[PDB]
Amino acid sequence: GAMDTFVQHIKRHNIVLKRELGEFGKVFLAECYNLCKILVAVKTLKDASDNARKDFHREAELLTNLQHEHIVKFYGVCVEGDPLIMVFEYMKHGDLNKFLRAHGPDAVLMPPTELTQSQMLHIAQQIAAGMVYLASQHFVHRDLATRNCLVGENLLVKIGDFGMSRDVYSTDYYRVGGHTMLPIRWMPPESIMYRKFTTESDVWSLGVVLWEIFTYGKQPWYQLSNNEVIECITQGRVLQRPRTCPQEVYELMLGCWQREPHMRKNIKGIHTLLQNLAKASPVYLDILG
C-alpha cells in the first residue's frame, strides 16, 4: 500500500543479536521485539562514509515498497547509533541450493526424503511468481540462482540473499575480463560479452534455476571449466534435460535460452505454465530433513 513507501524505523533495544552468520558489512541472526518476539536476519553497516550511509537509506527506500509473497520480507532499519542495521525475516530452512542438495539421491543414500517432481514444480512456480513481480517493478536482479533463494515452512520459497554468495559460493563466480566477479554459468551471451543485464537476462537465469531444481542443486555445466562454459553459451550448446524434468518444463527452459534476448519466453507466460503444472501435481507427501 501507499504507507509502505515510507521506511519503518526500529528501536536499537528491540534487536537482540544472536549469531554472526558471515560478512557492506556483517550479517546476523537476531530476535526482534515489538514488530509482530520473532527471529530476524540482519545486515549491519559499521562506521561508514556520508555517501555509504546515503546509499544505505537509498536501499532501504527501494526495499520498503518492493513487497511480494515471494520476495524476502524487509521489516525496516535501525539508525540509532553505530552500526546501522537493516532488518529482514528469518527463513527457517536457509538457502535453496543447500535445501535441494540435502534432499538429493546422494544425501538419501549417504534419512531425508528425496525431493519429488511435484515438490520441484511447487518450488519453481514460486520463484517465477517472484520474478513476475520484480519485472513489473522494472527491477533487474543480475544474480538469480538457487543459492540466492530462501526456504521457509510448508515448502514456502522466496527470492532473497544477504550479500554473502560471492564468498560462500566462490566457485559459482568468474573474473570476467579480469575485472568483475560474475555468475557466468547462469548468464546469457550478451551479459558475459557486453555486461548487458536486463529482464531478458534474468529470464535466461530462471531457465538455469529450473535446471538446478530438477537436478537437486547440481552446479550447471559441472563437467566444464569456466572457459568451456563461455564457449558453450556463446556457440549455442545447451544444458542436458534433467532425468526428473517433464518435457514441457525442458521446452520452457529452451525458450529461456534463446540467443536473442527479445526472442526469449516472457516471464508472465513462464509463471502461468509453471502455476498450472504445479496445481495439476500438488504437494501432499511428508518431507523429512
Q: Is there a binding annotation on residue 23?
A: yes
Q: Which residues of 213-240 are buried (b: 16+ CB within 10 A; e: fewer)?
A: bbbbbbebbeeeeeeebbeebeeeeebe
Q: Is there a binding annotation on residue 22?
A: yes
Supply 170's cell numbers: 566462490
Q: Is there a binding annotation on residue 217?
A: no
Q: Is there a binding annotation on residue 59?
A: no
Supply φ then ψ for residue 243, to 5 degrees: -55, -40
Q: Is there a binding annotation on residue 289?
A: no
CA–CA separation, 252 and 273 (whole Å): 9
Got the DSSP string for 38-101? Answer: EEEEEEEE-S--HHHHHHHHHHHHHHTT---TTBPPEEEEE-SSSSEEEEEE--TT-BHHHHHH
Supply 100's cell numbers: 535441494
Q: Is there a binding annotation on residue 24?
A: yes
Q: What count of other Cβ atoms lies within 10 Å of the Cβ of residue 82?
A: 11
Catalytic residue among 143, 161, 172, 202: 143
DSSP state of 140: -
DSSP state of 174: E
- Clarify whether 143 is annotated catalytic: yes
Strands 84-89, 74-78: parallel, antiparallel or unpaired by DSSP? antiparallel
Q: What count of other Cβ atoms lies within 10 Å of the Cβ of residue 249?
A: 23
Contact criterion met (CB below 8 Å) for 73 and 120:
no
Q: Is there a binding annotation on residue 27?
A: yes
The residue numbers preceding gaps of C to N over 2.5 A in the chain are: 23, 36, 110
Q: Is there a binding annotation on residue 25?
A: yes
Supply 226's cell numbers: 569456466
| Cell 529452451, located at residue | 254
Indicate which residues carry an active-site annotation: 143
Binding residues for ATP: 21-27, 43
